[PDB]
């Protein structure tokens, strides 16, 4: 039992370093956002305030 | 060289067949030679290994020791002979995994099926 | 451990039904014990015994129905042979070998001969 306990503690280390709040937290960030890195700004209507 | 069109000399295929062989194929993959005495007695060179045979270790660090087979671990591709173990200072004793091709059978476990198998391979029984 | 089918084949219908209800009672009390203990290795043997008894009863009834329909046209569809749908729809050997009288007389009169050139 303590062997398998030490196994699980050594296995959760990299997830802990990526700061996931469990094995069910699997939020994936995109590489680039289109609304942040596309378009130009003119003299008319704009996209954000 | 090979001549048949059904044999393959492909390393990838041979390694996949060995590592995904089932249990009844692993039985024939784990075969062990006989001693010179049993060879001259029976007329057989090698046999598949069984769980109650008395063997001798002829290769490795434990070369020279004897004992009976205690387990034939077909999943781990190994065999475990009694009285060949590694001991610890807290009193533990783990068994050593040995390959059957580095052993010599000195005495068989003879029943009806093994007698039929030796007569099938063309040996003598008297 | 468990029942053996070659021993079950030497019994009759009410004997197999009695053995079925005994095994069902035993599986019930084993589930009662499993409520308190996680590992009970007899549950597997009792389940395989129940499946074996049911198999033997079904094959006895099906053999009786086959002897009852022996030889007749129009057997039931599960007692009929199942190859494939296309194989069931294809022509038989008789219908495939039906031949016109004109062709039959022609094949009688002039069949293909055997010959050699060499001499």
């Amino acid at each position: 039992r303590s062997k398998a306990d030490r196994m699980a503690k050594m296995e959760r280390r990299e997830r802990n370093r990526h700061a996931k709040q469990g094995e069910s937290d699997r939020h994936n960030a995109v590489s680039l956002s289109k609304h942040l890195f596309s378009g130009k700004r003119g003299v008319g209507k704009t996209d954000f305030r | 060289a090979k001549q048949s069109l059904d044999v393959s000399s492909d390393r990838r295929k041979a390694r996949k067949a060995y590592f995904t062989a089932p249990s009844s194929q692993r039985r024939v993959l784990l075969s062990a030679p006989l001693s010179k005495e049993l060879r001259a007695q029976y007329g057989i060179k090698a046999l598949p290994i069984r769980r109650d045979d008395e063997v001798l270790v002829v290769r490795g660090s434990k070369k020279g020791q004897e004992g009976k087979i205690s387990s034939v671990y077909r999943l781990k591709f190994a065999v475990q002979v009694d009285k060949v173990t590694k001991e610890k200072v807290n009193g533990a004793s783990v068994p050593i995994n040995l390959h059957p091709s580095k052993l010599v059978i000195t005495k068989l476990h003879l029943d009806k099926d093994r007698k039929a198998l030796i007569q099938r391979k063309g040996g003598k029984l008297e | 451990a468990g029942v053996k089918a070659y021993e079950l084949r030497t019994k009759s219908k009410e004997q197999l039904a009695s053995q079925l209800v005994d095994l069902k009672k035993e599986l019930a009390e084993l589930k009662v014990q499993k409520l308190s203990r996680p590992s009970l290795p007899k549950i597997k043997t009792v389940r395989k015994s129940i499946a074996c008894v049911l198999t033997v009863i079904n094959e006895q009834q099906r053999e009786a129905v086959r002897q009852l329909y022996k030889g007749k046209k129009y057997q039931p569809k599960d007692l009929r042979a199942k190859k494939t749908r296309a194989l069931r729809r294809a022509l038989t050997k008789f219908e495939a070998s039906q031949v016109t009288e004109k062709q039959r007389k022609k094949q009688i009169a002039f069949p293909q001969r055997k010959y050699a050139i060499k001499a």
């Binding site: 398998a4 306990d5 094995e23 937290d25 | - | -």
Partner: protein, 50 residues
């Protein structure tokens, strides 16, 4: 939604029975590569979509 259908309640029951960590005797098997449950679900983390 406190007044649901049997289909929704059935999928909820399966998703409740699937919500467990890995059993510890599985880690002790020979050549075991499963180190965690990579399909674990949480109610506030990710949604089931009916």
């Amino acid at each position: 939604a406190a007044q649901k259908s049997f289909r929704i309640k059935q999928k909820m029951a399966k998703a409740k029975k699937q919500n467990r960590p890995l059993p510890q005797w599985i880690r002790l098997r020979t050549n075991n590569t499963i180190r965690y449950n990579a399909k674990r679900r949480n109610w506030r983390r990710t949604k089931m979509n009916i």
